[PDB]
Amino acid sequence: MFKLLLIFADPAEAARTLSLFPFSLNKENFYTYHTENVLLDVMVLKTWGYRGVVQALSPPPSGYDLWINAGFAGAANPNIPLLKTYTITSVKELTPTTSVEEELEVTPIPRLPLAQLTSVRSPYRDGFHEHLQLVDMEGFFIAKQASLVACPCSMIKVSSDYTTREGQDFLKNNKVKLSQKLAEAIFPIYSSFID
Amino acid sequence: MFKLLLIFADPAEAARTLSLFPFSLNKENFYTYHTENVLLDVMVLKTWGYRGVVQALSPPPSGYDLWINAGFAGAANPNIPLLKTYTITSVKELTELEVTPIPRLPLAQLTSVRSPYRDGFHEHLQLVDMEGFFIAKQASLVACPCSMIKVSSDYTTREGQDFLKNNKVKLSQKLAEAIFPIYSSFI
Numbered sequence: 001m002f003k004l005l006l007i008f009a010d011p012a013e014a015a016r017t018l019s020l021f022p023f024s025l026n027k028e029n030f031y032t033y034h035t036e037n038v039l040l041d042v043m044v045l046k047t048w049g050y051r052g053v054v055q056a057l058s059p060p061p062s063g064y065d066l067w068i069n070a071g072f073a074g075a076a077n078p079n080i081p082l083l084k085t086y087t088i089t090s091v092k093e094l095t096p097t098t099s100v101e102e103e104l105e106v107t108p109i110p111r112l113p114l115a116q117l118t119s120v121r122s123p124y125r126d127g128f129h130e131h132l133q134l135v136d137m138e139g140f141f142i143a144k145q146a147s148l149v150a151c152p153c154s155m156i157k158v159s160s161d162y163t164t165r166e167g168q169d170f171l172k173n174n175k176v177k178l179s180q181k182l183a184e185a186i187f188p189i190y191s192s193f194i195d
Numbered sequence: 196m197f198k199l200l201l202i203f204a205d206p207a208e209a210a211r212t213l214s215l216f217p218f219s220l221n222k223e224n225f226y227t228y229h230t231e232n233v234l235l236d237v238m239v240l241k242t243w244g245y246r247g248v249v250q251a252l253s254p255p256p257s258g259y260d261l262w263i264n265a266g267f268a269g270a271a272n273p274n275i276p277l278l279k280t281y282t283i284t285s286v287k288e289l290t291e292l293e294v295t296p297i298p299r300l301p302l303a304q305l306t307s308v309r310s311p312y313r314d315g316f317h318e319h320l321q322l323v324d325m326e327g328f329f330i331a332k333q334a335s336l337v338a339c340p341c342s343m344i345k346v347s348s349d350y351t352t353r354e355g356q357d358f359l360k361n362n363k364v365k366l367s368q369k370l371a372e373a374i375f376p377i378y379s380s381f382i
């Protein structure tokens with residue numbers, strides 16, 4: 001029996017995927033669905049408050065066969081069109097006050113185009129950048145927690161906004177469309193693990 | 196822009212497919228969704244069988260590039276397992292028309308009847324429904340290709356509907372999981 005964990009940063013990202021299957025809330029306060037040989041669970045990191053906390057995935061969930069982090073990401077290069085779904089090859093956490101970085105490889109999803117991801121704490125609205133592609137908040141954290149349970153981790157990121165002040169309105173106004181692109185990319189993955 | 200019409204005979208059969216996209220309700224039982232490249236419309240009949248087809252699809256809508264009739268079907272041969280999604284190659288009325296198969300689905304032939312068929316397996320039948328023949332006839336009027344997705348929902352023996360009633364969610368979800376990739380085939 002194949003056990004797949006989906007991880008979304010927030011409810012908006014998760015919404016359309018949660019519509020795809022008849023999930024139920026379990027007694028542990030997260031969403032679950034199973035059929036045939038597949039268990040499909042969903043966890044949402046930040047449902048409350050102004051920020052996510054480390055205990056959202058600490059200790060990391062044990063026992064799954066694959067984690068997929070699906071979410072929105074800002075485009076920091078104008079050559080990335082919006083509303084486009086990518087899979088991630090590597091994710092780096094960047095600390096802007098020191099320029100110190102860490103970086104982990106992640107497992108690409110078949111048939112999605114490849115991109116690099118940088119995770120940063122604060123929303124990225126500085127502008128465009130020579131050496132950034134997609135930018136999110138939680139990707140590195142999730143990949144690093146996955147390493148603690150030796151579970152492979154893949155990422156699906158949809159381009160949600162250009163990383164400028166003016167560009168944030170597009171994210172504000174297109175959350176349903178963006179969440180739908182995530183759902184459409186997740187389905188063929190789920191389907192490939194039916195035995 | 197590709198234009199797809201999906202037709203379901205009742206809301207329970209349609210329910211999980213309608214959960215797949217953030218459809219807008221244009222009018223009673225008529226749902227619409229689009230991206231730039233694909234228009235996806237869903238019609239749910241207001242009653243079953245030939246009467247419901249006539250009410251909803253006469254006149255037949257023009258302008259679509261494909262019609263898909265998705266629904267529950269009875270299995271009239273014990274060699275057909277239940278909870279299995281098939282695509283249809285031909286359809287006839289028990290009392291014939293080619294149908295366009297959806298790729299990567301098991302193949303079956305369909306017979307459309309005007310009353311719930313419970314006569315057992317004593318005929319060379321495969322899957323049995325109430326709407327498909329009549330929907331294919333309407334699609335022909337507008338020279339539109341027609342495909343059908345039929346999930347085996349009961350055996351055509353007495354009280355066989357109990358399996359369908361117990362498995363409504365799973366059956367409706369099987370239809371949704373066959374429909375979701377078709378939408379993606381046009382992007």
Ligand SMILES: Nc1ncnc2[nH]cnc12
Pocket residue numbers: 267268269270308310311312313323324325348349350351
């Ligand atoms: N047994 C049956 N007869 C006719 N139409 C059906 N649709 C589903 N089951 C059926």
